[PDB]
């Protein structure tokens, strides 16, 4: 165990890669629509994701869908390997 063990099924380079997409979408909502705009953007961030602003949350919703699916799938693969295992 450990806190360095709190960065495993997503790579050491993916946990630092998901943050690039978070600030990259909150800056597009700045351009398709500052203390209240950032409050709206992650008010729109945890609630999954104008015609220009709707396609921001529609595509961001599919991107975060695969990562949280690629996290739960890779985490279960270790627990199965750390299952039998002898």
């Amino acid at each position: 165990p450990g806190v360095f063990s709190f960065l495993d099924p997503l790579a050491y380079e993916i946990w630092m890669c998901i943050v690039f997409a978070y600030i990259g979408v909150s800056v597009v909502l700045f351009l398709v629509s500052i203390f209240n705009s950032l409050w709206f953007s992650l008010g729109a961030f945890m609630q999954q994701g104008s015609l220009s602003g709707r396609i921001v949350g529609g595509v961001w919703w599919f991107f975060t869908l695969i990562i949280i699916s690629s996290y739960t799938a890779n985490l279960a693969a270790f627990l199965t390997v750390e299952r039998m295992v002898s």
Binding site: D8, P9, L10, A11, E13, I14, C17, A21, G24, V25, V28, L31, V32, S50, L51, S52, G53, I55, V56, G58, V59, W60, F62, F63, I66, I67, S70, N74, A77, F78, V81, V85
Partner: protein, 35 residues
Amino acid sequence: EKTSALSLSNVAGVFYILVGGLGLAMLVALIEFCY
């Protein structure tokens, strides 16, 4: 059975489909700022 690793060589396939949506968003943001 050790790794069980999670090769981000293909996790980039998720990032390449998102930035295209942000660029598509900037084209609709300009036709809404003019119309």
